[PDB]
Coordinates of C-alpha atoms and ligand atoms in Angstrom, one line a residue:
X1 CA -25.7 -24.9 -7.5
X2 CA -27.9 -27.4 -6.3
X3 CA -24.8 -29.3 -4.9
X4 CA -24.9 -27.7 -1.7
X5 CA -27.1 -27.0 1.1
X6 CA -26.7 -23.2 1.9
X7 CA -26.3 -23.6 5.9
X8 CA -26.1 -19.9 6.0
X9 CA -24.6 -16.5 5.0
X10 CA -21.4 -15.5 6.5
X11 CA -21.4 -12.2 5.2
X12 CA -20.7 -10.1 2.7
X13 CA -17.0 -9.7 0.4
X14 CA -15.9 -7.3 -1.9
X15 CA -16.7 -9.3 -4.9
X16 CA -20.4 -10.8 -3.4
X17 CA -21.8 -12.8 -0.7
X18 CA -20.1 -15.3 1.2
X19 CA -22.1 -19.4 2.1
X20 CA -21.4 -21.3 4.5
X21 CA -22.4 -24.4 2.5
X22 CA -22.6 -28.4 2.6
X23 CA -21.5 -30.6 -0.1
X24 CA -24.1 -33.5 -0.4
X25 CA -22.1 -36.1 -1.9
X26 CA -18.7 -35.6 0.3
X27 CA -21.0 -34.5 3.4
X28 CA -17.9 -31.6 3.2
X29 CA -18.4 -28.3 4.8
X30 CA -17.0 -25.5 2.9
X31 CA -17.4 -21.5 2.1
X32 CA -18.9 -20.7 -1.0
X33 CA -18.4 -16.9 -2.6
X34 CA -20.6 -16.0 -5.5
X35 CA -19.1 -13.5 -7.8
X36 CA -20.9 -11.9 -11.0
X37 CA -20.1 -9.0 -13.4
X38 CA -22.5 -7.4 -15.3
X39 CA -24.0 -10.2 -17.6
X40 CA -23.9 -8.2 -20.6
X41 CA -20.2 -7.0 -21.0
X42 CA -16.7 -8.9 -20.6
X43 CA -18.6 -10.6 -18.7
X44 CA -16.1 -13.0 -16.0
X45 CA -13.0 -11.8 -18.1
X46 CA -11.5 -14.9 -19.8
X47 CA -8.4 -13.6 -17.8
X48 CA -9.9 -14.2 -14.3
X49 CA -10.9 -17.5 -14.9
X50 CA -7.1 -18.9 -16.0
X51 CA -5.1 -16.8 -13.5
X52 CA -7.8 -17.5 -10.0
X53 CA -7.7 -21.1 -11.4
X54 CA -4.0 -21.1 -11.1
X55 CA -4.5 -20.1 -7.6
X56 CA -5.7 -23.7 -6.7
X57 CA -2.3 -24.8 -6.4
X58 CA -0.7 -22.1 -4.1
X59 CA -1.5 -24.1 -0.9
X60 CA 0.3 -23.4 2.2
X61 CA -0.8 -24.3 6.5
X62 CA -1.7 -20.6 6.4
X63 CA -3.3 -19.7 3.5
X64 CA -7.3 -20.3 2.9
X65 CA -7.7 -23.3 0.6
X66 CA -9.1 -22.8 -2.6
X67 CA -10.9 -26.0 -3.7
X68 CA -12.5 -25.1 -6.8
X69 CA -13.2 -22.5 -9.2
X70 CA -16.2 -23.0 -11.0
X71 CA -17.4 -21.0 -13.8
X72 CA -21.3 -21.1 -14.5
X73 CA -24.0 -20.0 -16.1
X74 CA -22.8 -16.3 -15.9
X75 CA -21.4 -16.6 -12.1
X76 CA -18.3 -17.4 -10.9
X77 CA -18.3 -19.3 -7.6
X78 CA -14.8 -20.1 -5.5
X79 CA -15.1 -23.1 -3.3
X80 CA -13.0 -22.3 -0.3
X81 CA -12.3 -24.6 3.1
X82 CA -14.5 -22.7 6.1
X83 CA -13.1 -21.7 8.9
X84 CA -15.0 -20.8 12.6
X85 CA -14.2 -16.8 12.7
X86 CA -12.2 -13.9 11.3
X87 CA -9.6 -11.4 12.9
X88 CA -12.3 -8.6 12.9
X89 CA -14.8 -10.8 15.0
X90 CA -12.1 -12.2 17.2
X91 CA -10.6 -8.4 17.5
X92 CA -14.2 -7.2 18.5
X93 CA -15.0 -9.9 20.9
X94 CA -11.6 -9.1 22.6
X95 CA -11.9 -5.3 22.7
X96 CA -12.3 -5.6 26.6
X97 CA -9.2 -7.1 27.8
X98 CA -7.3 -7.3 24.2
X99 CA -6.0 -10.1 22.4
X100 CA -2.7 -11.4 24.4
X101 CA 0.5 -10.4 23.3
X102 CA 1.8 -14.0 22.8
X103 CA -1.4 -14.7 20.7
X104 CA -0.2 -11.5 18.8
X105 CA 2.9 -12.5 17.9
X106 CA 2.1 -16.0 16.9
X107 CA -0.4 -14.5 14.6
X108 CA 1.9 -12.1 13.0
X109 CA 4.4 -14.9 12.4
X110 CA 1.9 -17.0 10.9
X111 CA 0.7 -14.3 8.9
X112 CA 4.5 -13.4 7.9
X113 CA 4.7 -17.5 7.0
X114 CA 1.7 -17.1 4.7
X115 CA 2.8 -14.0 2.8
X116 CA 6.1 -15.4 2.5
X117 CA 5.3 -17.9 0.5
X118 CA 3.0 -16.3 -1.6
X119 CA 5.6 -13.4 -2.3
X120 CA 8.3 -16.4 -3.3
X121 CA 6.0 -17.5 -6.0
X122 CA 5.1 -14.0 -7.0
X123 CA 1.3 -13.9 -5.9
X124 CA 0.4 -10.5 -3.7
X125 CA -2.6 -9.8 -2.2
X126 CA -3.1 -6.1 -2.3
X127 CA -6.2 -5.7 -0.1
X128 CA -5.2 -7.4 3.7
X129 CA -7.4 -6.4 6.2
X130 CA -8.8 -8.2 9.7
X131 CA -11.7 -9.5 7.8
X132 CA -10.1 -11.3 5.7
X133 CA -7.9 -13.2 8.5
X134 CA -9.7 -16.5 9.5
X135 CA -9.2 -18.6 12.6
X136 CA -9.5 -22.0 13.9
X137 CA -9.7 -23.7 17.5
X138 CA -6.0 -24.8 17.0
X139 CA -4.3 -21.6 17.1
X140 CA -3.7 -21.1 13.2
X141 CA -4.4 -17.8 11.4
X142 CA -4.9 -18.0 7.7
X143 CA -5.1 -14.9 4.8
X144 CA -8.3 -15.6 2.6
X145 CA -8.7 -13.9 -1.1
X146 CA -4.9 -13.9 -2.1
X147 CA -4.5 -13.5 -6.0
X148 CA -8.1 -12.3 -6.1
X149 CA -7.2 -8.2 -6.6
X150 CA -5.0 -8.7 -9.5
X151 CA -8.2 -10.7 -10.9
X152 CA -10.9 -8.5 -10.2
X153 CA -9.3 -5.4 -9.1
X154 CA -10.4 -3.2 -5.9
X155 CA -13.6 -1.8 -5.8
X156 CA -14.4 1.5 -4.2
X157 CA -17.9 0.0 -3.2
X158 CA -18.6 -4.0 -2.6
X159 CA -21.6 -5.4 -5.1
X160 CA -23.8 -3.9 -1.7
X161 CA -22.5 -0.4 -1.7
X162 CA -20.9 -1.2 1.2
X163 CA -17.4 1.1 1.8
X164 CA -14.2 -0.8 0.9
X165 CA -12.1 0.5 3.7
X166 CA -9.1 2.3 3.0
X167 CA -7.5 1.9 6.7
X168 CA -4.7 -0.6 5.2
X169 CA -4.0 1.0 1.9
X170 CA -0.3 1.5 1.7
X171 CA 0.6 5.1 0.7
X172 CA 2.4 4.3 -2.4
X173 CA -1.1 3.1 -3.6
X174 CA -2.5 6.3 -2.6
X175 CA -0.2 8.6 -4.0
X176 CA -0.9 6.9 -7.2
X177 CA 1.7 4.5 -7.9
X178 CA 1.0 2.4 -11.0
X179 CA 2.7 -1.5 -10.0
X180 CA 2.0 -2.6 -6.4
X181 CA 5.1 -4.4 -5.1
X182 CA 4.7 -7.3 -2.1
X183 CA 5.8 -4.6 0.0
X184 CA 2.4 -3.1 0.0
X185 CA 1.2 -6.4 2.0
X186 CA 3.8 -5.6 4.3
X187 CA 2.0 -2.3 5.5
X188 CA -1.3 -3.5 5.6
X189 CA -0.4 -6.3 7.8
X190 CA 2.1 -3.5 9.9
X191 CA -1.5 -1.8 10.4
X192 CA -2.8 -4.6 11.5
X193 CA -0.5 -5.9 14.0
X194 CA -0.1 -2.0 15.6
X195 CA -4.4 -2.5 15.8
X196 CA -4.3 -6.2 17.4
X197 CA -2.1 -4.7 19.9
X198 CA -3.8 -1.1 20.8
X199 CA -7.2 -2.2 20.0
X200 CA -7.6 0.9 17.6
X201 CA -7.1 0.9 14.0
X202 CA -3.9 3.2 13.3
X203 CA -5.1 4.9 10.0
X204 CA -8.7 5.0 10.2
X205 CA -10.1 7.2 7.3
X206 CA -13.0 7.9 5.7
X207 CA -11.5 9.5 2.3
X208 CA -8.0 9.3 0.0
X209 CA -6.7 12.3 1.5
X210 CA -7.8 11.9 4.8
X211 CA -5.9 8.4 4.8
X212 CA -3.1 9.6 3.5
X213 CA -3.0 13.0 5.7
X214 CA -3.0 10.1 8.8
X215 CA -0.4 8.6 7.5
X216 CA 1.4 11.6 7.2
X217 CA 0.2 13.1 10.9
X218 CA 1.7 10.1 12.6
X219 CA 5.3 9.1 10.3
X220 CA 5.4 12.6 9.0
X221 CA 5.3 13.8 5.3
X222 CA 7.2 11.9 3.1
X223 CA 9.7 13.6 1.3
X224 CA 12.9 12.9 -0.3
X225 CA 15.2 12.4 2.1
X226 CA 12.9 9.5 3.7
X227 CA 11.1 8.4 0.4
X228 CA 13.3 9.2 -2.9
X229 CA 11.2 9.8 -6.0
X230 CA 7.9 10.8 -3.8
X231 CA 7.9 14.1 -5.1
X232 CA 7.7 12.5 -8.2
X233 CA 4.4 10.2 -7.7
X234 CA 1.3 11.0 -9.8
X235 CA -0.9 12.0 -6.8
X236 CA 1.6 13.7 -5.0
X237 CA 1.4 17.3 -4.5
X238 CA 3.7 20.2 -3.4
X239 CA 1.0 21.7 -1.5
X240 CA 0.7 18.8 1.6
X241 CA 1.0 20.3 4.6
X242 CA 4.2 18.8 6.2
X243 CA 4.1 17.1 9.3
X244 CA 7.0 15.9 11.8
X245 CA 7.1 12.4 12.6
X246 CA 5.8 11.2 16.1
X247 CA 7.8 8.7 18.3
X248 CA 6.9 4.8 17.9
X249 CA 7.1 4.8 21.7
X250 CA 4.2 7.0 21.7
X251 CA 1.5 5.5 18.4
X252 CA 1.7 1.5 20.1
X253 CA 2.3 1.3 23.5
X254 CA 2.5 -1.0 25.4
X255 CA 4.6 -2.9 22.7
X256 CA 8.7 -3.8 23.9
X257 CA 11.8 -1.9 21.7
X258 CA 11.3 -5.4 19.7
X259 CA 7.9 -5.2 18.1
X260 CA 8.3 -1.9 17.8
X261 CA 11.8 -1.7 16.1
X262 CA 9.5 -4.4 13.8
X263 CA 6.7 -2.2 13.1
X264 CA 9.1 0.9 12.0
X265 CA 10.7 -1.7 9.8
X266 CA 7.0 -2.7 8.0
X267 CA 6.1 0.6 7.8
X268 CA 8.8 2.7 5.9
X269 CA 8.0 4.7 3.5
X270 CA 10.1 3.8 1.0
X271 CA 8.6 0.0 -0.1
X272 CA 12.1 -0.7 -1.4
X273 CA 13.2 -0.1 2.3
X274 CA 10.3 -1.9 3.7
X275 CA 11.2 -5.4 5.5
X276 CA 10.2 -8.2 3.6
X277 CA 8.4 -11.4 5.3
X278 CA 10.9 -13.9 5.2
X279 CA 13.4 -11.1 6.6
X280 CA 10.6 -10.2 9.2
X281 CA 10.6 -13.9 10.0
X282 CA 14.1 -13.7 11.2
X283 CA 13.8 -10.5 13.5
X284 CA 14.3 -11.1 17.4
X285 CA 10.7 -10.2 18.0
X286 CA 10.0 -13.7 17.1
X287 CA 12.8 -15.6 19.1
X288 CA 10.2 -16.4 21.7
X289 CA 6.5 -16.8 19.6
X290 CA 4.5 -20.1 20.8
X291 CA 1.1 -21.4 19.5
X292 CA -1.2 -20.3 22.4
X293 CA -4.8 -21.9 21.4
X294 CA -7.6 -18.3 21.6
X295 CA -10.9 -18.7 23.3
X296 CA -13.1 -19.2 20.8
X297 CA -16.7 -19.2 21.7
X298 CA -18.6 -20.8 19.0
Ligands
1QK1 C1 -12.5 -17.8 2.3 C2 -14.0 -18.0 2.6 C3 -14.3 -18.2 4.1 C4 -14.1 -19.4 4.8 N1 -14.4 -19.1 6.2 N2 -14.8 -17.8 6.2 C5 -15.2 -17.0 7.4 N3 -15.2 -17.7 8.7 C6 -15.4 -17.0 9.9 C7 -16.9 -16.9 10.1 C8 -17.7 -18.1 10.0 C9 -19.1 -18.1 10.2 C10 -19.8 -16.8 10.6 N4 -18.9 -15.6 10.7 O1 -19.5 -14.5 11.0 C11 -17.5 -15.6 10.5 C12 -15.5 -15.6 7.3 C13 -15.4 -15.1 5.9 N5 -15.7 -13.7 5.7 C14 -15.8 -12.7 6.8 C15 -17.0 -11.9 6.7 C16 -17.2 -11.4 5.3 C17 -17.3 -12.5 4.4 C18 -15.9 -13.1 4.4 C19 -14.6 -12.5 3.9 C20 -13.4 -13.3 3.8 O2 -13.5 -14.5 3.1 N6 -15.0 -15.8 4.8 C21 -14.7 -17.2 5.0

């Protein structure tokens, strides 16, 4: 568009690049993503445009604003409020001394606030990871990109080759299960909680199996005592090596029997077992959470 000035690049998504951008006739600064297809086929499916547009109405304190959806020439841009950093910055920058538990935990409640709305009104996300967890000044977190996967689906590589990262994926995704559930938002955001608070992602790998043999390495194989019907899953095979389950005690120190009796709960195997967020709301983990305001160095 020439409706904006293009203050800079912020980076770079899964779907395309990502403006930091002016509006000239609000004086409004927002984030602009460009997204494309290639020109010739489907082209933007039809079916993107009606169910992302739908998405400008599921607003909530903790979820991204999506101001507009605006289909173009043969580009599809999303217009979305900015925000000063994301989670993967702010987890970088803090690698030294760590992000402070009470920070933690009023991050993980927003977070739970924001996904429990948009499980009530049937919207996952499918594809949570720090990078896609903004911050402001005041102490809010917000989720960015909700409703977006169904749309476009999840790439292996972004439009810029660049590795989609597995580290988040729950393992009913990986073992090949055909309808994700909300409960696979639950895991990625149990991986990111146990990584805010031991400054190491939990499940870093570089490959299916090798995400899913971490998995395994650290809660055990699944089998179906823990997990009924996993023998059952499309990628499963009889041949993984089968591996006992370490202690929570030993994968997230220094966390209290509270977050950790939490993080057990987000990570079950079963999804049907897994917490939900407005259940996760409600644990006593969260009988103390405060709004701390982070140091943010802009
Ligand atoms: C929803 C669009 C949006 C709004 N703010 N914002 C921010 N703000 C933080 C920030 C600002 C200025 C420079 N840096 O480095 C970080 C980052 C970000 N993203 C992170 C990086 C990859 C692109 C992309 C993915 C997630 O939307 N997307 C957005």
């Amino acid at each position: 568009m020439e409706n904006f000035q293009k203050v800079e690049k912020i980076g770079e998504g899964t779907y395309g690049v990502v403006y930091k951008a002016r509006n000239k006739l609000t004086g409004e600064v927002v984030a602009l993503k460009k997204i494309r297809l290639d020109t010739e086929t489907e082209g933007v499916p039809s079916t993107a445009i009606r169910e992302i547009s739908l998405l400008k109405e599921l607003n909530h304190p903790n979820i991204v604003k999506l101001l507009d959806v605006i289909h173009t020439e043969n580009k599809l841009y999303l217009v979305f409020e900015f925000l000063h950093q994301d989670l993967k910055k702010f987890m970088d920058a803090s690698a030294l001394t760590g992000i402070p538990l009470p920070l933690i935990k009023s991050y993980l409640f927003q977070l739970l606030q924001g996904l429990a709305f948009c499980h009530s009104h049937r919207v996952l996300h499918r594809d949570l990871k720090p990078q896609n967890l903004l911050i402001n000044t005041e102490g809010a977190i917000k989720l960015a990109d909700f409703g977006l996967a169904r749309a476009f689906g999840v790439p292996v590589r972004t439009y810029t080759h660049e590795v989609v990262t597995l580290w988040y994926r729950a393992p009913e995704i990986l073992l090949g299960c055909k309808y994700y559930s909300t409960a696979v938002d639950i895991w990625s955001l149990g991986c990111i909680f146990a990584e805010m608070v031991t400054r190491r992602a939990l499940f870093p790998g570089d490959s299916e199996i090798d995400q899913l043999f971490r998995i395994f390495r650290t809660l055990g194989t699944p089998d179906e005592v823990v997990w009924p019907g996993v023998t059952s899953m499309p990628d499963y095979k009889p041949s993984f090596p089968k591996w006992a389950r370490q202690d929570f005690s030993k994968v997230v120190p220094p966390l209290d029997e509270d977050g950790r009796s939490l993080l057990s709960q987000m990570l079950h195997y079963d999804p049907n077992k897994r917490i939900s967020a407005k259940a996760a709301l409600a644990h006593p983990f969260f009988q103390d959470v405060t709004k701390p305001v982070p140091h943010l160095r802009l």
